[PDB]
Amino acid sequence: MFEARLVQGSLLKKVLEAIKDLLNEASWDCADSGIQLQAMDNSHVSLVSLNLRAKGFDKYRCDRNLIMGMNLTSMSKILKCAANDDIITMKAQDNADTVTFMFESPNQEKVSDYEMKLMNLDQEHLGIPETDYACVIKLPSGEFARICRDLSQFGESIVIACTKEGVKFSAAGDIGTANIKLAQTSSVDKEEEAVVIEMQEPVTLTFACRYLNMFTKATPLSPQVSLSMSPDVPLVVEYAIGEIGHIRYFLAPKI
């Protein structure tokens, strides 16, 4: 069968939040190193890619191989029934028509068990045409978040411009023009505090806003986030899921 058992249930839930509003139905691929999730959002613009590795679960086990076709909203109700010390455990038979999550408690003895129904899908693994991007920004995830939320009240679009020393976010509305600017981190300190740019040649791109705002759902997962940018190639917002893997959001520029 399949029995992936994470010590810190919270994690999975967080991940649900990071997707939930983007994708309304996903197939979790299970194999010997772990689960992997590939989907193109409701409106087919952004792309989610999720990895979760065997070594990170307290107990991993995929004998055979599973495309689990879980609907995400339903799954979100279920996780939402967990607590934050709750031991999740997805479980499934080989061609299981159902996946079971089963929550235990560390300092209690209630034992939840929710079985949800699995769906069939086609799975369109468009690759991540791997490039070495022109500019890698690392920055505080909650900073990036505060930024994205703020600048949405002006434009529908965000201009992200990096140079060797700083990154700049900019928005123009029928209301006002707005410019937020981060300089780079003197003395490479705590990542909650650290802006660090590896800068080959300057990049300046426009992105849509609702999408940044949804990618920033993933903010709790890591206190850091990392925008990799090159011209004409999509943009990668990458949150580390903290030692178990990570989630990448892919978005195309405009203009």
Author numbering: 1 to 255
Direct quotes from the study:
Proliferating Cell Nuclear Antigen (PCNA) is a member of the sliding clamp family of DNA-replication accessory proteins. In most organisms PCNA is a homotrimer, in which its three subunits adopt a doughnut-shaped structure in a head-to-tail arrangement; this toroidal structure is extremely conserved in protozoa, humans, yeast and plants. The structure of PCNA is comprised by two α+β domains joined by an inter-domain connecting loop (IDCL). The inner face of the toroid has an array of basic residues positioned to provide favorable electrostatic interactions with the DNA-phosphate backbone.
Herein we report the x-ray structure analysis of the first crustacean recombinant PCNA (LvPCNA) and a model where PCNA interacts with viral DNA polymerase PIP-box as an approach toward structural understanding this feasible interaction. LvPCNA eluted in a complex of approximately 90 kDa, indicating that this protein assembles as a trimer in solution. Accordingly to this previous result the molecular replacement found a trimer in the asymmetric unit. LvPCNA had the cognate fold comprised by β-α-β5-α-β-β-β-IDCL-β-α-β5-α-β-β-β topology with pseudo symmetry within each monomer. LvPCNA amino acid sequence is highly conserved among species and is structurally similar when compared with Drosophila PCNA, as it had a root mean square deviation (RSMD) of 0.5 Å for the α-carbon backbone. The central hole is highly positive charged as shown in Figure 3 and has a diameter of 30.5 Å, large enough to accommodate the double helical DNA and slide freely on it. A peptide sequence containing the WSSV DNA polymerase PIP box was modeled and docked into the crystallographic structure of shrimp PCNA, which is its natural host. However, this is a tight packing cavity as obtained by docking, where mostly hydrophobic interactions are leading the binding, the hydrophobic cavity is represented in a surface image where the PIP-box peptide is positioned and drawn as sticks. This pocket comes mainly from the IDCL (G127, P129, T131), central loop (S43, H44, V45, L47) and from C-terminus (F250, L251, A252, P253, I255) residues. The results from docking suggest that WSSV polymerase has the capacity of binding the LvPCNA in the same way that most PCNA binding proteins do.
